[PDB]
């Protein structure tokens, strides 16, 4: 699941355009650091993935989606200026 979402790695401070064992682990660590950050808290859900929980960091503006079973689904940076982003901030619906 981490490989198919590497397209979002750049939102997590990893600009490596190359997708290899090295850059993937970097992405994996980037996700772990997001979830472990004191300022990262639960906020909303990704409806489609009914039951999922998202963890938001108001500093980096990144969200990471976790499935009901606790598996990593995806993640990316929220854009507060776009309707989708504003809607998520106000209602928690991603």
């Amino acid at each position: 699941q981490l490989d198919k979402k590497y397209k979002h790695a750049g939102d997590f401070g990893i600009s490596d355009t190359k997708k290899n064992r090295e850059t993937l682990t970097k992405f994996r660590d980037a996700i772990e650091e997001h979830l472990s950050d004191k300022d990262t808290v639960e906020k909303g859900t990704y409806r489609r993935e009914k039951g999922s929980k998202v963890y938001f960091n108001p500093n980096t503006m990144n969200v990471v989606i976790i499935k009901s079973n606790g598996e990593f689904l995806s993640g990316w940076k929220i854009n507060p200026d776009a309707d989708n982003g504003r809607i998520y901030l106000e209602t928690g619906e991603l």
Binding site: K4, K7, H8, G10, D11, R48, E49, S74, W76, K77, N79, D81, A82, D83, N84, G85
Partner: protein, 86 residues
């Protein structure tokens, strides 16, 4: 700019694949993220294209809310039409 929109058009023209579009759309979105003086219509269109691509999954075991190649094509076209950016 119109980078995300043009990428969408390139995809609808089948010049680039669904996988290529789903990946480049992420690169372009990040480039325009925060870029001041941006048309709300263009920004929001891009965001919906971004989310449509997020739902694309080429594998046959994709989730019920995920979509295949066709489908991404129909949603992308639907999104450009919604914002009148054909």
């Amino acid at each position: 700019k119109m980078a995300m929109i043009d990428l969408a058009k390139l995809f609808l023209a089948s010049k680039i694949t669904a996988i290529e579009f789903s990946e480049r759309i992420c690169v372009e979105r990040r480039r325009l993220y925060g870029v001041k003086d941006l048309s709300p219509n263009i920004l929001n269109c891009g965001e919906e294209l971004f989310m449509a691509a997020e739902r694309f999954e080429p594998d046959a075991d994709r989730a019920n809310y995920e979509i295949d190649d066709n489908g991404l094509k129909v949603e992308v076209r639907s999104i450009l039409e919604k914002f009148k950016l054909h």
